[PDB]
Design a protein around this ligand. Structure first.
Ligand SMILES: Nc1ncnc2c1ncn2[C@@H]1O[C@H](COP(=O)(O)OP(=O)(O)O)[C@@H](O)[C@H]1O
Ligand SMILES: Nc1ncnc2c1ncn2[C@@H]1O[C@H](COP(=O)(O)OP(=O)(O)O)[C@@H](O)[C@H]1O
Ligand SMILES: Nc1ncnc2c1ncn2[C@@H]1O[C@H](COP(=O)(O)OP(=O)(O)O)[C@@H](O)[C@H]1O
Ligand SMILES: [Mg+2]
Ligand SMILES: [Mg+2]
Ligand SMILES: [Mg+2]
Lengths: 99, 155, 461, 392, 523, 101
């Protein structure tokens, strides 16, 4: 849920099935943005849904789910990565090569 | 020779389905909603009318609007009747309890001969009498104490 | 109003309550009679008689008292001009209360209050049409029978006229406001043209609800709910007095007393649904701010209102209970037009009927019938005790005179009025009043004689 | 022991824990809370002396405590109390005629006569050593707000007393302008000369109505039309204020919605405008009479005619308990004044506030009746000798 | 019922302690307020145990009995009897309490004489009927010749205020009470005479205002005095209206439309004030509160604005200025405006009040009570309320009787003359009724300290042969003529003392059983 | 919302308006950013990528002593005569060295 007072008025029949498809397409949008750099290990601090695990499965990506904040700052110095908080703003310098 | 209309509907102005939000945009359509809420209740009273049903019985309450409508049309009503009494009333007059007022006809209304409201024991009682096809009865007990009539009911 | 935690005495409370709900005149005498049947059964219990055998003997003895009570009974009430048997019947009920200062005035109030509201075709009297109101101040002689209704007048404008000579009463049940629906609306306003449409909607609504009353020719309005401040000044500009916040059954009495109809909306107002009334005014009582409604003139009303005044609230709440017993004995005359003669005259005559049939035959229940006749003499000998006389001296004189000749209406009184003839002293009681005094006291004795165990608990906790 | 210049003060500690030092007889009896029903009537006697005269309030208990004490021997001599009440009225009607012959008719134009009257009431208080400053300030605070030789009444609610902790009683001031205890947001300027003060009762915030108002957002660019139109709304309010020509704004304290938002504060700081918040609704009568401003409710009527004027409107950064505002000089000043009371402790300021009110009430009695008598037990001896000869 | 008691926590008594507790509890009520009867009687000071005790001195017998809270069951009948006497006529609440207690004290003397209690009721009903004819035949009517009726009204207020705290103020407070009801010129509403109590000053400094006083002073930047103004009052909402449509919101799409709605809201509030000033007025009184947006509109037009006076404050202004409430402003030709001369503000006790000096059709008054303490002002307000209520009914019923003990000896003479024409069963109860009527001048005579055993004996010897106007002179302590001294009371006040005490003593004497129930939360 | 196609454009707008202010206060040469409010985890990415120091939740009394001593202007919002995002970049503070020891 976003940080607002978002409420949708569903009047037609096709509107409820469209919202549940836009929730699936939003996960596919951010999963397509992180595979443009061709990674191997995706490590985050928050939850990963099953739809996000589906795109990383066929792309052969090992995902770790709930690593701590203090452990993410420690692996950022060991592998040379940069902790990003935006999947569509990923760059080639944010990938921790050399591990 | 009255006719009894056994109902399971509310005769109040505030009959709400508890999920309706009537969003209006202008003041010309705002008055049309309030006129429609009276026209919903008055259409139900016209279905009870023009059928001979001078006596109205319903287990659901009747507001001040439908009470004054039957007083002007010289009709009697009785709201908040218990469900055990309406089941006995259905077998007495030989009618049927109609929840929807749109299907009212001569085959669903009752028929009796004497219908009065007496003053037995101080409290009023609306008694039905005269129907020959009566598959039920009512035994009114009169005693001098509440424990006296409970023993008389147990006996 | 007692705190008696005794299950035998609790049945005496429901016995006096059952007499009040059915007849409502002998609630005091039905408890002394029930205690008299049990006192005579105490000496019969020591002789070895079974308690059900005493109870079966009281049923055969009370049956003689019912058939003997229907011997002399006649009334000539026609509710037109022969109200003289109706006034003297109500004086017997009001003679024992504290309204003996108004013994002739208040007795005529309860007679005319019943006959104007009773349906003589069905012989049914409805006490919802008789409103009994009370206000402190004045005296007991200021109690008047107001043909109409008496409500608390709540004129929202202080400059309203306090006297209407000819009132075309417009009874309505809609509050003076823009019409609010019963459901959730959440009306949306988008532009400034919709907000200016909100001002013209309410300005024309208050001019529509005022003009629809004036087009019917009405000059008085009754409303169940409240008024708006904008609607208050429109009443004064159009010369339309109106009251505010009247109760539920109060406006139901206005439409019967004035002959009008209660209208739900403002659009259904017409000249046929208006009520007719005469002097409509409010009367201030001393230094208070009540200003009750007084309706002097009417036209064939079927609803009256008795306004009881007094010196304190103790004399008013008792007069509400005293006059209610006077309204019940007139109701019992329409249900049954047969009367008896009180003052202990009917109890002595019924005691002689059980003693004559105790010897026809004295097989088993001879002692049970003589205990019934000795207990029927407790009610006239209690009148001799309260009047300063002697019980056994006065009762032996009256009972012997009914055997030596044909039994007249022979009782007693306090000042004794000269002779002891109840027909000349006009002590008249209803037949079904004393018929239910013997019937209810016998059945309550049977339920307290046919009990041989008590299973009460001990302490409260 | 609390009467006269050689009297000592009393300290009453209540059940809450707020112990105050008081010498005035009205303030002592209201804090003692006597449980006797006859002694509570003597508390209300000193209360009405503070209302009518203001400077009679220990002496009304000494008289009424001795008039009943003289009735001890009268009730033990067979005299009915109705006879004592008849004779006390005859001694009262003869008592005013003795005090009227001792009175000297004075005029309010003589400052030396009014100075000796205010110095007499201060000799019994703790400020008797400060009578060289407080007693001249008590006369000038009255004779400039009464408009004399035209009226026989004076309201003491037009004289505000500000209690601030710090310094000594010699640091008191008689500033004729407005003194506010609120802070300045933002406090980057805190000084403006030739200031024009305006009282604003409008709320400089987001637009909202008395009716329920909601914003419908159902578009991508509709979120841009919410924030940027709210910035352009309050910019039209600040530029309407800035084009008027005022430099000091006084915003009334709003309870329903926010009076001054953070967006409205940033535009008023760039226009070099001193803003003061949290002005109470009961204090706007004293502001408009002192400076000469008018209460502006709607922004369309905010013109230059409803503004005030001030030669100096600065926030005096005090060394003691914070800081306050002080407006110095205004065109056409009203009949209001403000007295700033200092003190080393919180108990001395509460006594100095009651002693100043006992000094302003002395000059209040000279407006109603322009007559005075000798003090220091002088008229009590003449009331004792003339009524003794009247009793013979 | 005491033997084999079938009650849980309730007790009762029959004919032994029933009349014993009824006669003890009723005499002790009458002996309490016995010292407050007459022009020389003392007053009481009422106090509580604590927790905002709020001491209230009263001499009137109704205010004493309504605050004591008697636990006796039969004593509550006499407490409720004096409550109706204050609400109906407003005077004689002390006289009806002593008279109802002296009847039961004489009825306690008939306990040992073995008189039946129903004989005493029948003996007192004939005694009360003989006492009604004594007051009705001795009532003095006043029709025309109004210079004798205004002199008769000053004797009514002089008799009522003589038994109160206003003893040596009859030269002033009689004129404050007669002229207050005389300025009503109609019905006795008893609310147009607004009494304002202010501390400071003596009772001689009190006065009757020629106009009207009010609070909630005139705005912020509005004029304080307007000469020859037209007063228009109102009972309408000024700002934050939320006008009568419950369930109406402002659903817009952008914040620029909210600025257009709130400007349209202030334009309709400005147009409402523009409809008010089309009448051509200079003063405005609203019963509701006036906020800042219409207050600037009245100040710019030079119009006063009195906000939130009172709910009953607009009623007194409508009776003192001759206008109407006028809660709707859409017809200036159908709204009647008030009239005044000066709306200057006066200062009474360091408080600025709005003085409506020089009003036309002023059927309302304002009494400015000034006293030494708050206890005197609370007593003088109830003392003036006991004087204005009798004069509001003396103008409705002009029949007056001679008070000061003269009316009680006329009533006691008619009972004693008919007590000798009765048999001995009821004649003893009628003699006890006449002895209780003679106790009412005996309490007045003994409260001053006079010889009450001889003055009532001189009144009984005077009324036995002529002297229908002979009464008790409390000034010198002798017997004088009541028509010369001018000590008169109203007929309806003296009738309600006789009639309500005879009805209340009838109830308590007929009680033979006091069955009190078990109280709640009392252990 | 009445159309499901306009759902993701509103959800992305809550961060695009946020990142719009963070790019125009950072491209003008600002390296040290002090904030008395709160900087969440999404906004911390734009300072690590650009190589800037961002200090959050500082005291209001400490910000006034820094801005007066370094010549910075205590800004609360957007301003300067109906501008979208101007920030008045000539009113930035100066420092010789900002070092966390
Ligand atoms: N004038 C009279 N003479 C003789 N007896 C009377 C007279 N008036 C009333 N009574 C008697 O007083 C009794 C009062 O009974 P009451 O207590 O009213 O009964 P209830 O409690 O059922 O109303 C009556 O039974 C009647 O016989
Ligand atoms: N300089 C002085 N010399 C002698 N007596 C003084 C002097 N100053 C004040 N007093 C006396 O001190 C008394 C103070 O009375 P005070 O307590 O102020 O009365 P109140 O309580 O009514 O204000 C006065 O009665 C006055 O006679
Ligand atoms: N000037 C007078 N001369 C003689 N008697 C007086 C005079 N003034 C008052 N009284 C008597 O004092 C009594 C006061 O009664 P009061 O306590 O006022 O009764 P209530 O409490 O019912 O008003 C009156 O009954 C009256 O007869
Ligand atoms: Mg009876
Ligand atoms: Mg002093
Ligand atoms: Mg009196």
């Amino acid at each position: 849920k976003g940080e607002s007072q978002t409420d949708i008025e569903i009047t037609r029949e096709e509107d409820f099935t469209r919202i549940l498809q836009m929730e699936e397409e939003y996960i596919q949008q951010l999963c397509e943005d992180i595979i443009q750099l061709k990674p191997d290990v995706v490590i985050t601090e928050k939850g990963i849904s099953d739809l996000a695990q589906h795109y990383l499965m066929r792309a052969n990506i090992t995902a770790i789910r709930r690593v701590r904040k203090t452990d993410n700052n420690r692996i950022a110095r060991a592998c040379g990565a940069r902790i990003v908080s935006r999947p569509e703003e990923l760059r080639e310098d944010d990938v921790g090569t050399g591990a | 020779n009255p006719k009894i209309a056994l109902l399971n509907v509310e005769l109040e102005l505030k009959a709400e389905k508890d999920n309706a939000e009537i969003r209006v945009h202008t003041v010309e359509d705002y008055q049309a909603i309030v006129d429609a809420e009276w026209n919903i209740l008055y259409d139900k009273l016209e279905k009870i009318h023009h059928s001979g049903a001078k006596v109205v019985s319903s287990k659901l309450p009747i507001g001040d609007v439908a009470t004054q409508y039957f007083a002007d049309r010289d009709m009697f009503c009785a709201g908040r009747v218990p469900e055990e009494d309406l089941k006995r009333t259905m077998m007495a007059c030989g009618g049927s309890i109609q929840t929807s007022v749109n299907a009212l006809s001569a085959d669903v209304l009752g028929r009796c001969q004497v219908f009065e409201e007496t003053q037995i024991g101080g409290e009023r009682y609306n008694f039905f009498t005269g129907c020959p096809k009566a598959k039920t009865c009512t035994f009114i007990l009169r005693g001098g104490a509440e424990q006296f009539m409970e023993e008389t009911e147990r006996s | 109003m007692m705190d008696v935690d005794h299950q035998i005495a609790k049945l005496m409370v429901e016995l006096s309550k059952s007499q009040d709900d059915e007849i409502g005149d002998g609630t005091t005498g039905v408890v002394v009679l029930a205690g008299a049947l049990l006192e005579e059964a105490e000496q019969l219990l020591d002789r070895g008689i079974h308690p059900i055998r005493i109870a079966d003997g009281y049923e055969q003895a009370a049956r003689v008292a019912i058939e003997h009570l229907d011997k002399i009974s006649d009334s000539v009430l026609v509710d037109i001009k022969d109200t003289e048997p109706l006034i003297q019947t109500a004086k017997t009920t009001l003679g024992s209360k504290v309204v003996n200062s108004c013994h002739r005035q208040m007795a005529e109030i309860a007679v005319n209050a019943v006959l104007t509201v009773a349906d003589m075709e069905r012989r049914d009297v409805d006490f919802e049409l008789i409103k009994v109101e009370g206000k402190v101040g004045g005296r007991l002689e200021d109690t008047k029978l107001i043909k109409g209704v008496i409500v608390d007048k709540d004129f929202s404008h202080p400059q309203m006229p306090k006297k209407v000579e000819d009132a075309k009463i417009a009874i309505l049940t809609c509050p003076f406001e823009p019409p609010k629906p019963k459901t959730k609306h959440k009306l949306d306003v988008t532009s400034v043209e919709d907000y200016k449409a909100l001002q013209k909607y309410e300005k024309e609504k208050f001019e529509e609800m005022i003009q629809q009353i004036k087009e019917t020719g009405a000059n008085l309005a009754i409303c169940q709910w409240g008024f708006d401040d904008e609607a208050n000044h429109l009443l004064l500009q159009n010369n339309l007095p109106a009251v505010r916040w009247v109760g539920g059954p109060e406006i139901e009495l206005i439409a019967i007393a004035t002959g009008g109809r209660i209208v739900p909306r403002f659009s259904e107002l017409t000249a046929e649904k208006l009520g007719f009334a005469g002097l409509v005014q409010e009367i201030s009582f001393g230094t208070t701010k009540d200003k009750m409604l007084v309706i002097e003139q009417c036209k064939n009303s079927r609803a009256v209102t008795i306004f009881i005044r007094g010196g304190n609230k103790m004399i008013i709440e008792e007069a509400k209970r005293s006059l209610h017993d006077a309204l019940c004995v007139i109701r019992n005359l329409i249900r049954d037009n047969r009367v008896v003669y009180g003052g202990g005259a009917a109890e002595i005559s019924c005691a002689l009927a059980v003693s004559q049939e105790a010897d026809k035959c004295p097989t088993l229940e001879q002692y049970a019938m003589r205990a019934f006749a000795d207990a029927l003499e407790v009610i006239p000998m209690a009148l001799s005790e309260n009047s300063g006389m002697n019980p056994i001296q006065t009762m032996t004189e009256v009972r012997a005179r009914q055997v030596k000749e044909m039994n007249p209406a022979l009782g007693i009184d306090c000042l004794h009025k000269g002779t002891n003839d109840m027909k000349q002293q006009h002590v008249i009681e209803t037949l079904i009043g004393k018929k239910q005094q013997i019937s209810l006291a016998t059945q309550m004795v049977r339920m307290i004689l046919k009990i041989d165990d008590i299973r009460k608990p001990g302490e409260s906790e | 022991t609390s009467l006269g210049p050689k009297g000592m003060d009393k300290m009453i500690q209540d059940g809450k824990g707020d112990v105050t030092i008081t010498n005035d007889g009205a303030t002592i009896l209201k804090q003692m809370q006597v449980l006797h029903p006859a002694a509570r009537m003597l508390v209300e006697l000193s209360k009405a002396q503070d209302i009518e005269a203001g400077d009679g309030t220990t002496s009304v208990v000494i008289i009424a405590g001795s008039l009943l004490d003289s009735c001890t021997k009268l009730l033990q001599k067979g005299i009915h109390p109705t006879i004592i009440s008849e004779s006390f009225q005859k001694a009262l009607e003869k008592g005013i005629e003795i005090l009227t012959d001792m009175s000297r008719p004075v005029e309010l134009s003589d400052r030396e006569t009014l100075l000796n009257s205010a110095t007499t009431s201060l000799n019994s208080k703790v400020v008797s050593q400060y009578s060289s400053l407080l007693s001249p300030m008590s006369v000038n605070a009255v004779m400039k707000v009464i408009d004399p030789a035209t009226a026989t009444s004076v309201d003491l609610r037009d004289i505000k007393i500000v209690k601030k902790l710090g310094g000594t009683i010699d640091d008191c001031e008689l500033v004729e302008g407005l003194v506010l205890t609120q802070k300045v947001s933002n406090s980057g300027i805190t000084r403006v000369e030739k200031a024009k003060i305006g009282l604003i009762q409008f709320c400089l915030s987001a637009p909202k109505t008395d009716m329920d108002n909601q914003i419908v957002v159902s578009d991508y660019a509709q979120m841009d039309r919410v924030l940027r139109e709210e910035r352009a709304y309050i910019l039209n309010l600040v530029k309407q204020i800035k084009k008027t020509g005022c430099n000091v704004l006084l915003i009334q304290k709003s309870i329903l919605r926010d009076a001054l938002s953070d967006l409205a504060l940033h535009f008023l700081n760039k226009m070099k405008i001193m803003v003061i918040k949290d002005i109470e609704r009961e204090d706007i009568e004293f502001i408009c009479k002192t400076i000469g401003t008018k209460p502006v409710a709607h922004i369309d009527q905010f013109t230059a005619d409803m503004l005030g004027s001030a030669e100096l409107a600065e926030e005096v950064n005090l060394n003691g308990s914070g800081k306050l505002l002080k407006i110095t000089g205004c065109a056409s000043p009203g009949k209001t004044v403000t007295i700033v009371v200092r003190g080393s402790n919180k108990l001395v300021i509460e006594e100095a506030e009651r002693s100043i009110h006992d000094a302003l009430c002395v000059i209040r009695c000279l407006v109603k009746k322009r007559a005075l008598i000798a003090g220091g037990g002088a008229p009590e001896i003449e009331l004792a000798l003339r009524l003794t000869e009247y009793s013979r | 019922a005491p033997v084999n008691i079938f009650k849980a926590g309730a007790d009762e008594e029959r004919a032994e302690t029933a009349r014993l507790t009824s006669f003890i509890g009723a005499i002790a009520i009458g002996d309490l307020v016995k010292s407050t009867l007459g022009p020389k009687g003392m007053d009481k000071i009422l106090l509580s145990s604590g927790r905002d005790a709020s001491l209230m001195v009263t001499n009137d017998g109704a205010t004493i009995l309504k605050n004591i809270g008697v636990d006796n069951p039969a004593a509550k009948v006499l407490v409720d009897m004096s409550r109706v006497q204050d609400d109906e006529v407003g005077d004689g609440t002390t006289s009806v309490t002593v008279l109802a207690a002296e009847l039961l004290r004489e009825a306690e003397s008939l306990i040992a004489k073995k008189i039946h209690p129903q004989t005493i009721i029948a003996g007192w009903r004939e005694a009360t009927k003989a006492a009604r004819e004594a007051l009705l035949s001795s009532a003095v009517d006043h029709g025309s010749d109004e210079v004798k009726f205004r002199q008769d009204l000053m004797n009514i207020a002089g008799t009522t205020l003589s038994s109160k705290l206003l003893t040596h103020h009859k030269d002033h407070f009689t004129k404050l009470a007669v002229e207050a009801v005389l300025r009503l010129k109609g019905s006795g509403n008893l609310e147009a005479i607004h009494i304002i109590k202010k501390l400071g000053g003596s009772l001689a400094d009190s006065y009757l205002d020629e106009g009207f006083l009010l609070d909630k002073k005139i705005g912020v930047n509005q004029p304080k005095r307007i000469e020859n103004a037209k007063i228009l009052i109102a009972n309408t909402g000024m700002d934050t209206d939320k006008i009568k449509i419950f369930g109406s919101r402002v659903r817009v799409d952008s914040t620029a439309k909210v600025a257009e709605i709130e400007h349209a809201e202030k334009e309709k509030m400005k147009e409402k004030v523009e409809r008010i000033l089309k009448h051509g007025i200079n003063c405005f009184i609203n019963r509701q509160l006036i906020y800042n947006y219409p207050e600037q509109l009245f100040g710019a037009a030079g119009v006063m604005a009195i906000e939130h006076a009172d709910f009953a404050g607009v009623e007194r202004l409508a009776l003192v200025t001759g206008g109407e409430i006028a809660s709707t402003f859409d017809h200036p030709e159908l709204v009647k405006l008030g009239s005044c001369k000066l709306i200057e503000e006066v200062m009474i006790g360091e408080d600025k009040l709005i003085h409506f000096s020089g009003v036309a059709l002023g059927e309302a008054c304002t009494i400015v009570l000034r006293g030494a303490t708050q206890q005197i002002l609370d007593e003088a307000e109830r003392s003036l309320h006991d004087a204005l209520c009798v004069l509001a009914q003396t103008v409705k019923d002009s029949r007056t009787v001679y008070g000061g003990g003269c009316s009680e000896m006329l009533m006691a003479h008619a009972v004693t003359q008919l007590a000798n024409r009765t048999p001995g069963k009821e004649a003893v109860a009628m003699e006890s009724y006449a002895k209780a009527l003679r106790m009412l001048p005996t309490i007045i005579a003994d409260n001053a300290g006079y010889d009450s055993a001889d003055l009532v004996a001189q009144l009984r010897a005077a009324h036995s042969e002529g002297n229908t106007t002979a009464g008790l002179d409390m000034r010198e302590g002798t017997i004088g003529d009541m028509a010369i001294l001018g000590i008169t009371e109203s007929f309806q006040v003296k009738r309600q003392v006789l009639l309500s005490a005879a009805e209340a003593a009838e109830v308590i004497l007929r009680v033979d059983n006091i069955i009190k129930a078990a109280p709640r939360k009392r252990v | 919302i009445t159309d499901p196609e306009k759902l993701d454009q509103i959800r992305q707008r809550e961060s695009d308006i946020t990142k719009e202010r963070i790019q125009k206060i950072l491209a003008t040469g600002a390296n040290v950013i002090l904030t008395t409010g709160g900087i969440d985890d999404m906004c911390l990415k734009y300072f690590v990528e650009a190589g800037a120091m961002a200090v959050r939740r500082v005291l209001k009394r400490d910000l006034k002593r820094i801005a007066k001593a370094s010549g910075a202007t205590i800004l609360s919002t957007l301003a300067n005569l109906e501008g979208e995002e101007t920030f008045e970049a000539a009113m930035l503070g100066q420092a010789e060295e900002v070092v966390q020891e």
